Amino acid sequence: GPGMSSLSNSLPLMEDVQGIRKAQKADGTATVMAIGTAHPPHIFPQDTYADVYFRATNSEHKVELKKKFDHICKKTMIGKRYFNYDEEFLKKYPNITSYDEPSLNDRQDICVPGVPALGTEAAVKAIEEWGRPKSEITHLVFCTSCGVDMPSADFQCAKLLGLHANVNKYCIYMQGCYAGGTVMRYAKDLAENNRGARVLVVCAELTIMGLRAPNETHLDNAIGISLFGDGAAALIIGSDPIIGVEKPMFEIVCTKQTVIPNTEDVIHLHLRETGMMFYLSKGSPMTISNNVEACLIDVFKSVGITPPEDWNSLFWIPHPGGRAILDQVEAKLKLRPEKFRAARTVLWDYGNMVSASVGYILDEMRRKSAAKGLETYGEGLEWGVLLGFGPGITVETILLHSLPL
Amino acid sequence: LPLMEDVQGIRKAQKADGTATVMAIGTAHPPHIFPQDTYADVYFRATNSEHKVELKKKFDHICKKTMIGKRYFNYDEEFLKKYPNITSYDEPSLNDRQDICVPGVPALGTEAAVKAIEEWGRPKSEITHLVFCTSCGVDMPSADFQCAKLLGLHANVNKYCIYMQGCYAGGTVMRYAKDLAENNRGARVLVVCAELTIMGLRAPNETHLDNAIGISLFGDGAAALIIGSDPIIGVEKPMFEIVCTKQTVIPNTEDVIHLHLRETGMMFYLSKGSPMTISNNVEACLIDVFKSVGITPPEDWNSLFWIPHPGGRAILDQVEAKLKLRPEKFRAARTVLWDYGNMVSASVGYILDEMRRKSAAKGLETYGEGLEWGVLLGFGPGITVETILLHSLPL
Ligand SMILES: CC(C)(COP(=O)(O)OP(=O)(O)OC[C@H]1O[C@@H](n2cnc3c(N)ncnc32)[C@H](O)[C@@H]1OP(=O)(O)O)[C@@H](O)C(=O)NCCC(=O)NCCS
Ligand SMILES: CC(C)(COP(=O)(O)OP(=O)(O)OC[C@H]1O[C@@H](n2cnc3c(N)ncnc32)[C@H](O)[C@@H]1OP(=O)(O)O)[C@@H](O)C(=O)NCCC(=O)NCCS
Incomplete structure (x- = not known):
C-alpha cells in the first residue's frame, strides 16, 4: 500500500x-x-x-x-x-x-x-x-x-x-x-x-x-x-x-510520444463552423508501419532493456485506426496472426472509438486471459506495448508489464 | 526481458x-x-x-x-x-x-x-x-x-x-x-x-x-x-521550487465565469460577483496547500511573496483586503496588469519574471522578494482556483 x-x-x-x-x-x-x-x-x-x-x-x-x-x-x-x-x-x-x-x-x-x-x-x-x-x-x-x-x-x-x-x-x-x-x-x-x-x-x-x-x-x-x-x-x-x-493488473513502465517528420498532412482534423472536418491520406498505414519499430526500440532502451529479437514475445494493444493499420504493423513487426486478436475483436464489435478503443482492448485482453485461466492479464506474457496512432503523425508508445493472475 | x-x-x-x-x-x-x-x-x-x-x-x-x-x-x-x-x-x-x-x-x-x-x-x-x-x-x-x-x-x-x-x-x-x-x-x-x-x-x-x-x-x-x-x-x-500544487473547484459557481466556442467564436460571460467568489474562498485554498505539505500557515500573509493572476483590478483589491496585505505585496502583479493587461494564462509568468528581475536588481536575499515561501494563484472558469506553493532560492 x-x-x-x-x-x-x-x-x-x-x-x-x-x-x-x-x-x-x-x-x-x-x-x-x-x-x-x-x-x-x-x-x-x-x-x-x-x-x-x-x-x-x-x-x-x-x-x-x-x-x-x-x-x-x-x-x-x-x-x-x-x-x-x-x-x-x-x-x-x-x-x-x-x-x-x-x-x-x-x-x-x-x-x-x-x-x-x-x-x-x-x-x-x-x-x-x-x-x-x-x-x-x-x-x-x-x-x-x-x-x-x-x-x-x-x-x-x-x-x-x-x-x-x-x-x-x-x-x-x-x-x-x-x-x-x-x-x-x-x-x-x-x-x-x-x-x-x-x-x-x-x-x-x-x-x-x-x-x-x-x-x-x-x-x-x-x-x-x-x-x-x-x-x-x-x-x-x-x-x-x-x-x-x-x-x-498492468504496470506502466515507460511512456513516450513520437512525431514522424514530414507527415503533417497525413491525418489532420480542423474544428470549423461546419464542425470537425476530417482529412486522411492513403499513406497512413504504411507511414505508421515504417516508423513503429523505432518507437518500440526507443521505449525499451529508455529503461535499459534490450529490445526483444522477436516481437512475438510481447502482448499487444494497438489502436485499431483501420484494418490496414493493424495488418501492416503486424507484418512489419513479423507478428503471428493472433497477436492483434484482442484489437480485431474490439474493432469488429465496436469500431474505432477514438481514444476509448485501447481501453476497450485492454479490458478485452484481461477478461479473455482470466476466462482462459492464463498466467497473466497480458495473455500469459510478462511484457507488452499499448500503441496510439493519430494526427502528426504522432505515435504514443506505452510499455506495460503484466502482473500474474 | x-x-x-x-x-x-x-x-x-x-x-x-x-x-x-x-x-x-x-x-x-x-x-x-x-x-x-x-x-x-x-x-x-x-x-x-x-x-x-x-x-x-x-x-x-x-x-x-x-x-x-x-x-x-x-x-x-x-x-x-x-x-x-x-x-x-x-x-x-x-x-x-x-x-x-x-x-x-x-x-x-x-x-x-x-x-x-x-x-x-x-x-x-x-x-x-x-x-x-x-x-x-x-x-x-x-x-x-x-x-x-x-x-x-x-x-x-x-x-x-x-x-x-x-x-x-x-x-x-x-x-x-x-x-x-x-x-x-x-x-x-x-x-x-x-x-x-x-x-x-x-x-x-x-x-x-x-x-x-x-x-x-x-x-x-x-x-x-x-x-x-x-x-x-x-x-x-x-529560482523557484514547486513544492505543492492543488486545483480547487468552488461549488455552485458555474454561472460566474463561463465561455463557449461557437460559430461566432468565443462567447464570454461574466457575473458581477466574480471578485467576491474568488476573495472569499482564496484563504481556504491557501490553508489547504500548506496543510498538504505539513507546514503551519503564517499568521501574517505578508510573510509570503505573491503571484496572483490579475483577472481584474477588483479581484486583486479584494484578495489583498481579505488576506490583509500591504499595498506593496501585489506590486509585481499590478505593474504587469498596468503594462500588459490580462494576458490570460501568460500573466502569472510575466509576474514571476518581473518579481525575480526586480529582486535581482534590488540585491535582495531570494528571487521571491527576499522571502522564503510564496504562492502563485490562478483564477478562472468553474470557479476554479489553482494554488501553487513555491519556495524561492538565494541569488
Ligand atoms: C479504409 C480501409 C479499411 C479500406 O481497406 P482497403 O483494404 O485499403 O481497401 P481497398 O484497397 O479495396 O480500397 C477501397 C478504396 O478506397 C481507396 N482509399 C483508401 N483509403 C483512402 C483515403 N484515405 N483517401 C482516398 N481514398 C482512399 C482506395 O484508393 C480504394 O479505391 P480505388 O480503387 O477507387 O482507388 C483501409 O484503407 C484502412 O484501414 N485505412 C486506414 C484508415 C485510417 O487511416 N484510420 C485512422 C485515421 S484517424
Ligand atoms: C471591470 C472592473 C475593472 C471595473 O472596476 P469597478 O471598480 O468594479 O467599477 P465600478 O464599480 O464603477 O463599476 C462599473 C460598472 O460596471 C458594472 N459591472 C462590473 N462587472 C460587471 C459584469 N461582469 N457584468 C455587468 N456589469 C458589470 C457595475 O455594475 C457598474 O455599473 P452600474 O453603475 O451601471 O451598476 C472590475 O469590476 C473587475 O476587476 N471585475 C473582475 C473582472 C473579471 O472578472 N476578470 C476575469 C475575466 S475571466
Missing part, C-alpha cells in the same frame, strides 16, 4: 523542502487496477451502414458513390458500432446531415453535455470494480476530441460523479486517435509522483461532431465516417497497490 | 531526486500597442458602434477603472478592416478566428520559448517535455505539435496540450510541470503559455454588457518557463 499514515512516509515537522518531496512522492510503478466501459444505445450494423448513411444524408441518388462506399464498409472489418443518435434523431438536424451547412453550434449542444455524461457511465463502472470510495480519487484525466467548453469536460465529469472539490483535473482535448495512449502517459507521472494518488482516466467520444454527407472530392471523409463509433473507457491507475483491496 | 522483481529497480532509476524548479523565464507579446486611454475610441470605431453613445460612456468609465495602461495585439485597425465579421456582434466568424489563432498562437509562444531557452543556456536537445497552453484556437495536430516543430525539438519530446483552461491555466502549467520534472530523472520541461485574444473580439451590446468588460481586460501575450528537478550546479540557475 501507499503507507500514507506510516512514520517512514511522514511529512517533516520543519519546512524541509527535500523532506516534503520524499514524503510526497510514491514508491512504485503506476498500475492499472480497474477498467470500465460504456457505449450509447443505438446499434448500427456495418452490413446495412451504406444504406442507413446514404438515406440519412439525402445521398441515395449518388449511385456510383454508394457502391464505392459499400465496398469500403466491407473492408473495414467492423461488424457494428454504437451511436447516441438514430435515424429519427438526425431528422431534427438537416444541417448535420448535409456536407457544409453551419452546424458547429448544434454539434456543441450535443457533445458538450453528452461526452461527460457518456464518460461518467464508464467511470461509474470503473469505480465499482475498484471498490474504494469515490472520495479517494485524487486525480481526474478526461479525454475527448468531441466538443470543447469553459469550464471543460473534466469539470462536468467531476460534477456528475460527485468527486471531491480538490480533485486535480486534466483535460486532454483534441488529441485524436493517439489520445488513448496519452492518458496512460499522464496517469503514469501523476500516480508515481504522488503518494496515495488514485487517478481516474476517462476517454469518451461522440462522433456526431464529425458526421456529414459524403462527397466525391473529399472521399477520405466518408472513409472516416465508416470507421468512427461512439464509446467510453475508464481506468483507475495508482502506484503502490493495497493488498487484499485493490487488484493490480 | 527482466523479471517481476526488476520493475521497481527500473522505477528507482527513472525518477528524479529533488523538487521541480523554475530555472528560466522568457516572455513575448505582439507589436501593436493599444493605450487604454484611447481604447473606447478605437474599439467603438473599429466595430462601427459610434452611434451607441450611452454604451460608449459606460465602456470608457470601465476602461478607466481597469488600471490597465496599455495592451498588445497581433492586429491594428487596418488588419480588422479585412475581417468585418469579427468586428460585428454575431456574424459567422470562427473560421477566420481559427485561421489567425491556429498558426499565430504557437508562433507567439515560440518567441517566448526562444527567450527562455536562451536564458537557460543548455541545448534545445535537452528539452524532454513540452507543456503548451492556450484558450485561443484548437486544431489536430495541436498547438504543442506546432510549437515543437517551430523550435525544432526532438521527435520524441513528450508533449502536453492544455486547451481552453482559461485564466487559471497559468497555474495549471506549473501543476503539470511539477509531476513531469519530478517523476523523470534528467527531465527538462518547457512550459509555454500563449494567447491571441482576437478569438473573443466582437462588437459591444447593451444586453451583453459583461462581454464589454472582457474586451477592456484581455490582451495578447506569451510566457515560457524551463522547469526541472536536480539543477546542475554551475550551469543552471535555480
